[PDB]
Structure 1
Amino acid sequence: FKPFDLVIPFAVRKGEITGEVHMPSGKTATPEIVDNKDGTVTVRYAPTEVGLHEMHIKYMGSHIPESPLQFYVNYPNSGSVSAYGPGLVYGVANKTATFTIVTEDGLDLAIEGPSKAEISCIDNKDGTCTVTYLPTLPGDYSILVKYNDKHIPGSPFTAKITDD
């Protein structure tokens, strides 16, 4: 299972940053959270279930603005199409947001939220391509990925764009 790894720009001070991942079964687990003493923290988690997970991050008991987040965990042994990367989950407004589509196996992409974002992918020639978008305004962005008039697993995705 591809690990969840994310840098969030939240500056931890006197309070404790905590987290909770909710799995599709109903099980909860605690992600690993590391304060990079510096304006940020890093959240990591190793999935054991397939599909849509919720990540909650809190500071002093209360959700950060960047929280809750959604992420979709692909089945590894699965051939056929997939997407993954931080731009499906979270980004900062006016910084670049990126994810990967795997196509080692007709691709339709749209990104729609607060501001007009016009995706195009760039083929890595390694059976994957890389989408990068510029969400200029903060909000919730829906990212639609289809392979044959059909949503791939996780599509449409929702990525949360903040600025702090």
Structure 2
Amino acid sequence: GSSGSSGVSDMNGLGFKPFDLVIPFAVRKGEITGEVHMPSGKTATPEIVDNKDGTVTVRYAPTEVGLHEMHIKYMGSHIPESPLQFYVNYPNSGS
């Protein structure tokens, strides 16, 4: 008795809430790259998606808890938005 589509699996699916971000300045997909520093001691790359307007949206869904530091560089140059830090709170937190 509830709209149930085929998505989430047994192994895994929707862990921690996602993190969408949009660069303030205008960039052109190409000589740009991004990196993510996990608190556990690992690393991962963000998600560079070119919006249907002409901008980009850096999205990175956290897999573990703790503090993660993102590092994005545009054409071999650090941006005024990075580096940055985002704490991963537990799921279904808060009363």
Q: Return the TM-score normalized by structure 2.
A: 0.70
Distance change >3 Å, CA 15–CA 49, structure 1 → 2: same
Q: CA deviation at 1:61?
A: 2.5
SS at match of 2:58: strand
Q: Which residue of 2 aligns with 1:48?
A: 63
CA RMSD between the two structures: 4.6
Q: 1:75 to 1:35 in 2, by over 3 A?
A: same
Structure 1 Cα separation of the partners of residues 62 and 20 of structure 2: 11
Task: State the shift of 1:34 in Å.
Answer: 1.5
Q: Distance in 2 between matches of 1:58 and 1:75?
A: 29
Task: Work out the CA distance in 1 between the residues paired with 2:42 and 2:22.
Answer: 24
CA contact (8 A) 1:11 1:38 kept: no
Aligned pair in 2 of structure 1 residues 71, 12: CA closer, same or farther (>3 Å)? same
**Structure with more strand by fraction:** 1
Distance 1:35 1:16 in 2: 14
Count the aligned residue pairs.
80
Query: How many percent of aligned residue pairs carry the same amino acid?
Result: 99
Secondary structure at the residue paired with 1:21? Answer: strand
Secondary structure of 2:85's aligned partner: strand
C-alpha separation in 2, matches of 1:45 and 1:39? 20
Gaps of 5+ in 2: 1-15
Unaligned regions of 5+ residues in structure 1, if any?
80-163
Decide whether the 8 Å contact of 2:22 with 2:57 is kept in 1: yes
Residue by residue, what CA displacement relative to the aligned partner does 1:91-111 show, whole Å, maximum 9, x if unpaired?
xxxxxxxxxxxxxxxxxxxxx
